[PDB]
Every structure is written in structure tokens, then in C-alpha cells.
Amino acid sequence: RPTVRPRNDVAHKQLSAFGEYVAEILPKYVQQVQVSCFNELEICIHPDGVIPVLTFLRDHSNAQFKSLADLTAVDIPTRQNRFEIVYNLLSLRFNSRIRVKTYTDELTPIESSVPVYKAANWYEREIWDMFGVFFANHPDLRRILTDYGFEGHPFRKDFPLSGYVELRYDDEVKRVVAEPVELAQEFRKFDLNSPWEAFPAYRQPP
């Protein structure tokens, strides 16, 4: 079928088998395992298990996920633990990828994974900067992307797109100053969602 993405059952079965393998070996930490219809494996864990689970996947002979592809956060305000912490890992030995997910809120530290991957250093600084998730035992946790003295965590869903302050050069004080934001043209919010359901397969129970 020319327009439809072909399925890959063989990879789906392999990744499912490995997902059970991980769950059996680390029952203390694994809460959910799932494989998407495009064959990506996700391990959902208790936050206490960040270091043991990541170490296992890096070092175990049947895993060897030696490369941390990416580390990021997602803000979901409706959840009690609004922040989802996503680790994307790559195994060159087995030419495979795995995603490890955990959660935290605004006041609960997550264990820094710099001991497992040195790559994690800056990714965790960015998560702290943009989302305000604190990582315990980080060698140097501080803002990385925002301005010095910037207040707030911009990537949170309740942070306004245009922020609270804006900058200009003021001649009286002969320096750049920060003042409350005023826009000559307000950003125009669009309501795009169709009132008609698009995907029956994902309908939620009433």
C-alpha cells in the first residue's frame, strides 16, 4: 500500500521480549513497559530507579546502551507529578534504541545521572533551566540557556509565550533595562481543534 507506513512485526516482537527482560530483572523499579506501533520501546520507572536502571542498561552485556542520545522533560500540568523525565538511549552493539521515563514534581529532586553518562551534565542543566526540576548531586547545576537573573522556567505550560519582561536601551541610565512586557500587537490565539473526533482507536472510556 503505497501511502501507508509498513509495519515491522519482527522488530516489534524483539523489542517486546527485551522489555519483559528488563522488567523481570528490575522489578523494584519498573512500573510499565510498552512498545509503540512504530516499534519504540519505553520503560516507565519509579524515580528512585534512575541510577540502577540506567546503569544496568549501560553496562549489562545484553543491553550495552553506551550512548545517551537525549535527556529532556515534558510538563503535564494535570498530573500530580507534572514533569515527565525522558531518557533516550542508543545501543551500538545491538543497533537499538530504548526510552526510559520517570516523573517528578516541582519540589522533589531527581538523582543526577552524570555518573552514568557524562553527556547528562548539560541536559540536566537545561531541564533545570527550562522546567525547574532539581537534580541532586550535579557537579554544577545552574542556568544554561536563559539570561542571567531570569525569573521563571519558560518551558512550563503555564509560563506565557512572551514572558513577563522585555529589554530596551534606556538613555537616561545609559544601559539596557528590563521592563514589563507590552506588545504593539498581541499574539493572536487560534482555536484550531475540530469538534469532531479524528482517531477512534485512542478514544478514552467515558
Binding site: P27, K28, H46, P52, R93, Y202
Partner: protein, 114 residues
Amino acid sequence: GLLKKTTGLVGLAVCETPHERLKILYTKILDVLGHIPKNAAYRKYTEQITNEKLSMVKAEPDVKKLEERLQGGQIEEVILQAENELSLARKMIQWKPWEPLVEEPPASQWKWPI
């Protein structure tokens, strides 16, 4: 069985006695694994793959043919992976991840879309 000049990976030295090094390492792993409960999946699975690797090492004196059996790259990569497993096994004893789940997630923690 001539000794190769280079592994081709920067920082990974050539190993002069790969068979002895691997026999020592795999035996060490099985020793550390004896301290893990018998019904822990980490022990059962790691003992199984370790023993298979140890049998290959004993059944192949040719390094290049041994490398092909193990499918782990250079024999020096295989030695490094064994050292990683030995280090992991010692961490697992302290972590004890075979214990029951510490805590269930809140009700809708892994529900997507919301």
C-alpha cells in the same frame, strides 16, 4: 595467531593474553553472582550468558575465530564489556533490584493523552 598492531579504537589497548584475561573475568563474574539470591532474574540471566561466553573462550584458541563466535567486536571490546558486567554485578548487590516494586505510580501517571 599473530598479535594485531592496533584495535582501531582510540584508547583501547591491544591485549596480549585475551584468553587468560577473559577466563579470569568471567570466573570473577560467576563468583560475584553467587552472592545474589538464586531466584533473582539478574543472576539467572547473567549466569546463563556468562557461561556461554566462557564456554566459547575454552573451545576456541584462535582469537579471530573466537571473536567471530562471540559477535562482540574486537576481543578487547569483549574484555571491556566483561569488566563492565563485573562492575555492574557488584552494584546490583547493593541495589537489590529483584525486590518488589517500591511504589506504584499515581493513578493517571502514565496515561497519554490526558
